[PDB]
Each structure stands twice: as structure tokens, then as C-alpha cells.
């Protein structure tokens, strides 16, 4: 664990997708690497003997330093309860800005701990439009495959999918989508589907078939600590320091960068502060975490020479959640896997460009609800800005900016409602139909080739690199983590061969 006064060759801030890629490639190149993570390592059993808590009866392990459990669905037939808990270094951070809540994973593995495991490669044509500076041949011939393979991506057995009661909700969602002319697609995942069959057979401990996902999975889900980070640790050159929040990065005297961090206990109390010197720093604190850091450092005069583009172009991957009421003959089932495997792909339609996951609502009883999380091609963006008064970084995103996304989603769902003669639910979230006040997919803030060079370097400060979701221009049209991993793979390849 890092100590005040230490000097290290390479320091990776954060341990999500970008961080895990940076750590693996650096250590394989033989460079001793330190990861600093603000959350805890999730490899120690809790009170009940399990590492993570489930969603039906969550405890303090659920939330990052909060007083109530939380998720988008709110108090709906027993699901999504807001129970009082003690402040603890739990796994899911519902980080509130003025116009949006940004859900983020905290701990060794970052968002991989809490996400739905959906591993989607973006459409080449859209990729080529939004990231024109990137050689797409390299991406599709090499980096995307490298990412999918490293992540442990696999596909569900389609025959098993058709027969199992656990995916009845997905079959119902497929049926009504197709009746209205919409294309559906299976979605690859890092959840071990062979393990899932055994869960269904009652031969192994249930996780995905046991009400677990958003506060972690005790089995089945291949989070980064089981893949990239395990491989990085196998080199013998990785050190992970947990419960340390990086608060400041500034040029050190002579060379390198002073990195200030707050050590916290498991209740979130700062117990000590340390400053270490690093020759190279890799920002992988996430779209929000890295943007807040760099926007603060620039505003407070620590890295005053950073680009004017730092803080610009944040987006929410057009996230909109909605639920529809099925008629009684279209039940969705009392047994629902927590891992989505199917989506509605309408991205090609210029008038309603959305890719919607058919999401489970694993309440354990028949609700007749079809739930969807839509990625819409919402052009709206926002920026982070340092608030002098408060000393905090604000996000200028306004909830009204989700209106364009709702209009796009509505074009698809209104058509299905018209065909099926159904209405939307208005009770899943305060009498609101559209879940438009949160995102699971923060993207941007430090755009590739705008705030950084074409490989994620901050050119004004040699030795500083950005390798995470802050690089992505606000929207990729699909679940983001594969893109973040593949971009990180591309960047590390170049940086290691060119700079190191
Ligand atoms: C509920 C939910 C469901 C999702 N489902 C999917 C899905 O199925 N598929 C998909 O593609 N995407 C999904 N996502 C999004 C995906 O998880 C993120 O896009 C991804 O994890 C971002 O990768 P990253 O490396 O940019 O950062 P993160 O994975 O967010 O990692 C950032 C890490 O840095 C740490 N950190 C932050 N600030 C500091 C600091 N100052 N000091 C030190 N450490 C710090 C954080 O604790 C965290 O561990 C989902 C997200 C959520 C919240």
C-alpha cells in the first residue's frame, strides 16, 4: 500500500475498465504499477458470509456513503426499496448533480462490479462518424476483438433461452417488439451463461437467477477483478491500494507529479492524507471522476495549462427508462434473470434512433410490466465547471435536455402501445412515466483528440494520460464498456511502444 513520500514509476487512478487495461498492459511490459482505488476490495465476506448483498433485501454494502438504499425503480411491488442503512463504503454510488444522478460502481473493478455485463461492440458506421480520428480498421481487426476476448465475452445458448422460465420477460418483450416491425437482437455478456444453466438446474448458488446484479454478483458475473485485474496481478508487478481517494495532481519539483490522496476508513471518515510522486499518471477515475479532477486542477491553478476543452462534451448515452403494461395474456413471469440478454435495435431509423434493452424487473411475482432502458441518439451535451463558491465541480446538465431522447423513445414505444392497446406505467420511479433523471452511462468530459491528443495524452503535461470513459464523445449508441476497453487497448499499445 502507498505511503506518503513514495516515488513510483506508474500510478493508475481508479480500477474500472480503463484502469484495468492500463494496469495489465503496463505490468506485462514489465513496469511496476500502482493502482489507487477509492473504494474497497470486494473479496472479503460480509455478515451473512457473502461478499455482496442482493437487491430484494439490500444492506449497507449496497450504497457508497449513503443513508438509504437506491436504484431507479422505486418501491414497486416490493422491488427497489429505500431502506435506511449506515454510511459504508458500499458498491453503488448514486452521485447527485443538479440535473441528473450518475450511478457509478466504487471498488476494485469499478463499474464492472455493479453493471449488467452487457458487452456490445458499436456499429462500425456510427463508430466511424463519432470518432473520425481513430483508425477503424485497427479497431475492428484488432482492438475490439482483443477487448471482447480479454473481457470473457460469451453468448447465451439460444435453445436454452427459448425454454427457460427465467427469460419469459425477454420473450414477451421480443414478441411485442416484433409485432410492431422492430428488430430484436441478442446481447453478448461477461456473465458465464454455462454457470447460469446450472443455477437454473439448482446445482450451483444462484446469483443472476437469485436477485443479484446492481449491488454486485456473488457468482457468475466476470467482473474485472476476475479477468483483467487477475491477469495484471499474476505478473507480480501490480500493487492495489484501496480506500484512497485522489484529490490533487500537480507537477512535482524536478520531475513527475505529486499525487495527493485521502485515506478513508470504511465509514468514509478521512483518517490520513498522503502525497506520493509518480513519473507517469493514468487517469481512469471514470467520465465523472476524471473530469472532476482535471477541471478542479485547472481551475485551482495546479494544472493551469490544460486545454480549454477539459470539461466539455459530457453526455449521458441518451439514457431513458420506461415501462409498459402488458395485457394479461402477455405475462412476463415471476422468475426473472437479472441479466438482460435481448434488445430492440432501431438505431438505423433516423426518426427514432434508439437501442433499448429489454430489462428485467425481478420482483419475484407477476407484474405484467415490460421494462426498457433506451440508449437514444440525443445530441444534447453538457460541461463540468468548477464552482468557486462551493469548491466543488458542477455538471451543467439539465433534466430538460433529456426531452429529445424521450421524443425518440416515444416514437418506438407509442407504436407498440398502439398495436397492443396498452398504456405506460406511471408508478415505477412520483407519478412519472419517463425515467429521465439518471444515467448509468456517463461519457465524455475529456474528449479524445480534443482535450487530449489522439492517444489520450495530455500534451501540456508529459506523463499524464487519460484512459477511461471521459475520452468518449457522450454517446456510442450501445452499452459502453466494450468501447472504453477497446479504446484503452488501442491507447496503451501506442503509449507503451512510443513513450515508455
Ligand atoms: C447499474 C449500471 C448498469 C450498467 N450496465 C452496463 C452494461 O451492462 N454494459 C455496459 O457496457 N455498461 C454498463 N454500465 C456502464 C459501465 O459500467 C461503465 O461505462 C464503465 O464501468 C465505465 O468505465 P471506466 O473505466 O470509465 O470507469 P468506472 O468503471 O466507473 O471506474 C472508475 C473507478 O475509479 C474509481 N475512482 C473514481 N474517482 C476516484 C478518485 N478520485 N480516486 C481514486 N479512485 C477513484 C471509482 O471508484 C471506480 O472504481 C452500467 C453502469 C451502471 C452504474
Q: What is the distance in A from the centroid of ligand 1 to the CA of 27?
A: 22
With a Cβ cut-off of 6 Å, ligand 1 is lined by 13-19, 36-39, 103-107, 110-112, 114-118, 214, 245-246, 284-287, 289, 440-441, 468-469, 479-481, 484
138 half-sphere exposure, CB direction, 13 A CA radius: 11
Catalytic residue, candidates 199, 244, 420, 441:
441
The CA-atom distances, in angstroms, between 265 and each of 59, 169, 295, 346 are 18, 42, 27, 47
Q: What residues form DSSP beta bridges with 395?
A: 384
| Cβ atoms < 10 Å from Cβ of 281 | 23
Degrees (nearest 5) of the Cα angle 435, 439, 440?
Answer: 120
Helices (H), 387-445: 403-420
What letter would DSSP give residue 269? -
CB–CB of 363/79 below 8 Å?
A: yes
Q: What is the distance in A from the centroid of ligand 1 to the CA of 111?
A: 3
SS3 323: strand
Three-state secondary structure of 327-350: CCCCCCCCCCCCCCCEEEECCCCC
| Backbone dihedral angles phi then psi of residue 267, each to the nearest 5 degrees | -100, 5
- For the CA of 107, the closest atom of ligand 1 is 49
323 is in an annotated binding site: no
Our mutation pick for probing the ligand 1 site, out of 71, 285, 295, counting the most ligand atoms within 8 A of Cβ, is 285
The CA-atom distances, in angstroms, between 377 and each of 246, 336, 395, 407, 476 are 33, 29, 20, 11, 9
Q: What is the distance in A from the centroid of ligand 1 to the CA of 17?
A: 7
26 half-sphere exposure, CB direction, 13 A CA radius: 27
Report the alpha-carbon distance of residue 52 to residue 42 in Å, rounded. 8
CB–CB of 365/77 below 8 Å?
A: yes
Question: Structural domain boundaries of the chain?
Answer: 6-151+214-318+381-397+437-499, 152-209+319-380+402-436
Q: What is the distance in A from the centroid of ligand 1 to the CA of 314?
A: 15
SS3 87: coil
Helices (H), 164-312: 168-179, 193-200, 228-234, 286-299
The CA-atom distances, in angstroms, between 280 and each of 5, 46, 51, 125, 247 are 16, 36, 33, 35, 17
Q: Among 438, 440, 459, 493, which residue's Cα sits nearest to residue 309?
A: 459
The CA-atom distances, in angstroms, between 77 and each of 81, 324, 331 are 9, 15, 16
Q: Which H/E stretch holds residue 276?
A: strand 270-283
Chain centroid to Cα 135, Å, comes to 25
Report the alpha-carbon distance of residue 46 to residue 99 in Å, rounded. 35
Pick the CATH number of 6-151+214-318+381-397+437-499 from 3.50.50.60, 3.40.50.300, 3.30.2350.10, 3.40.50.970: 3.50.50.60
Q: What residues form DSSP beta bridges with 96?
A: 101
The CA-atom distances, in angstroms, between 5 and each of 183, 251, 252, 273, 274 are 57, 15, 12, 11, 8
DSSP notation for 169-199? HHHHHHHHHHHTT--EEE--BSB-HHHHHHH
What do you get for the CA distance between the two ends of the chain, in Å?
A: 24
Is 312 a residue of the active site? no
Report the alpha-carbon distance of residue 473 to residue 312 in Å, rounded. 9
Task: Please tell me the residue having the least CA distance from ligand 1 atom 14.
Answer: 115
Is 441 a residue of the active site? yes
- For the CA of 20, the closest atom of ligand 1 is 25
Method by which the coordinates were obtained: X-ray
227 half-sphere exposure, CB direction, 13 A CA radius: 27
Catalytic residue, candidates 212, 312, 357, 420:
357
261 is in an annotated binding site: no
19 is in an annotated binding site: no
Instruction: List all residues 6 or more positions away from 355 whose beta carbon is below 8 Å from its beta carbon.
Output: 343, 344, 345, 346, 347, 374, 375, 477, 478
Q: Among 324, 345, 337, which residue's Cα sits nearest to residue 479?
A: 345
The CA-atom distances, in angstroms, between 139 and each of 128, 142, 148, 250, 258 are 10, 6, 12, 33, 34
What sign has the CA pseudo-torsion 207, 212, 216, 222?
Answer: positive
Report the alpha-carbon distance of residue 384 to residue 287 in Å, rounded. 11
What sign has the CA pseudo-torsion 307, 308, 310, 313?
Answer: negative
Degrees (nearest 5) of the Cα angle 203, 217, 112?
Answer: 140
- Quote the CATH superfamily of domain 152-209+319-380+402-436: Cholesterol Oxidase; domain 2 (3.30.410.10)
Q: What is the distance in A from the centroid of ligand 1 to the CA of 469?
A: 8
Strands 270-283 and 464-466: parallel
| Cβ atoms < 10 Å from Cβ of 75 | 12
CA dihedral 117, 121, 127, 130 (to 10 degrees): 0
Q: How many residues does the chain have?
A: 500
Amino acid at each position: 500500500t502507498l505511503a506518503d513520500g513514495d516515488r513510483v514509476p506508474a500510478l493508475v487512478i481508479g480500477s474500472g475498465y480503463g484502469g484495468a487495461v492500463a494496469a495489465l498492459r503496463l505490468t506485462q511490459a514489465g513496469i511496476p504499477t500502482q493502482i489507487v482505488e477509492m473504494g474497497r476490495s470486494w473479496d472479503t465476506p460480509g455478515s451473512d458470509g457473502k461478499i455482496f448483498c442482493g437487491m430484494l433485501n439490500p444492506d449497507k454494502r449496497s450504497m457508497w456513503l449513503a443513508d438509504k438504499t437506491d436504484q431507479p425503480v422505486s418501491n414497486f411491488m416490493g422491488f427497489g426499496i429505500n431502506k435506511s442503512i449506515d454510511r459504508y463504503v458500499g458498491v453503488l454510488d448514486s452521485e447527485r448533480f443538479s440535473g441528473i444522478k450518475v450511478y457509478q460502481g466504487r471498488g476494485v473493478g469499478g463499474g464492472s462490479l455493479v453493471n449488467g455485463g452487457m458487452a456490445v461492440t458499436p456499429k462500425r458506421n456510427y463508430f466511424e462518424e463519432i470518432l473520425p480520428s481513430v483508425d477503424s480498421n485497427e479497431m475492428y481487426n484488432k482492438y475490439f476483438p482483443r477487448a471482447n476476448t480479454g473481457l470473457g465475452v460469451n453468448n447465451i445458448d439460444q435453445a436454452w433461452f427459448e425454454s427457460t422460465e427465467w427469460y419469459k420477460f425477454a420473450r414477451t418483450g421480443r414478441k411485442t417488439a416484433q409485432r410492431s416491425g422492430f428488430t430484436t437482437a441478442f446481447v453478448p455478456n461477461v456473465y458465464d451463461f454455462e454457470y447460469m444453466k446450472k443455477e437454473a438446474a439448482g446445482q450451483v448458488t444462484k446469483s443472476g437467477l437469485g436477485g443479484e446484479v446492481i449491488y454486485g454478483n456473488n457468482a457468475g458475473k466476470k467482473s474485472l477483478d476476475k479477468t483483467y485485474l487477475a491477469q495484471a496481478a499474476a505478473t507480480g508487478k501490480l500493487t492495489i491500494t484501496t480506500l484512497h481517494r485522489v484529490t490533487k495532481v500537480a507537477p512535482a519539483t524536478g520531475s513527475g507529479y505529486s499525487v495527493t490522496m485521502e485515506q478513508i476508513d470504511e465509514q468514509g471518515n478521512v483518517v490520513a492524507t498522503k502525497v506520493v510522486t509518480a513519473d507517469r499518471v493514468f487517469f481512469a477515475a471514470g467520465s465523472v471522476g476524471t473530469s472532476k479532477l482535471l477541471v478542479s486542477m485547472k481551475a485551482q491553478g495546479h494544472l493551469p495549462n490544460l486545454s480549454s476543452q477539459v470539461g466539455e462534451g459530457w453526455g449521458n448515452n441518451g439514457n431513458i427508462m420506461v415501462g409498459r403494461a402488458n395485457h394479461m395474456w402477455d405475462a412476463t413471469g415471476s422468475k426473472q434473470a437479472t441479466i438482460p440478454t435481448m434488445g430492440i435495435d432501431n438505431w438505423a431509423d433516423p426518426t427514432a434512433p434508439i437501442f433499448a434493452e429489454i430489462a428485467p424487473l425481478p420482483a419475484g411475482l407477476e407484474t405484467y410490466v415490460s421494462l426498457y432502458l433506451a440508449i437514444t441518439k440525443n445530441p444534447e451535451r453538457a460541461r463540468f465547471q468548477f464552482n468557486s463558491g462551493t469548491g466543488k465541480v458542477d455538471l451543467t446538465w439539465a433534466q430538460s435536455q433529456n426531452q429529445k431522447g424521450i421524443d425518440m423513445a416515444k416514437k418506438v414505444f407509442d407504436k407498440i402501445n398502439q398495436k397492443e392497446g396498452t398504456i405506460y406505467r406511471t408508478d415505477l420511479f412520483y407519478y412519472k412515466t419517463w425515467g429521465d433523471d439518471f444515467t448509468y452511462h456517463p461519457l465524455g468530459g475529456v474528449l479524445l483528440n480534443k482535450a487530449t491528443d489522439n492517444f489520450g495524452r495530455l500534451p501540456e503535461y508529459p506523463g499524464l494520460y487519460v484512459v477511461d470513459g471521459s475520452l468518449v464523445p457522450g454517446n456510442v449508441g450501445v452499452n459502453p464498456f466494450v468501447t472504453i476497453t477497446a479504446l484503452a487497448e488501442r491507447n496503451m499499445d501506442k503509449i507503451i511502444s512510443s513513450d515508455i
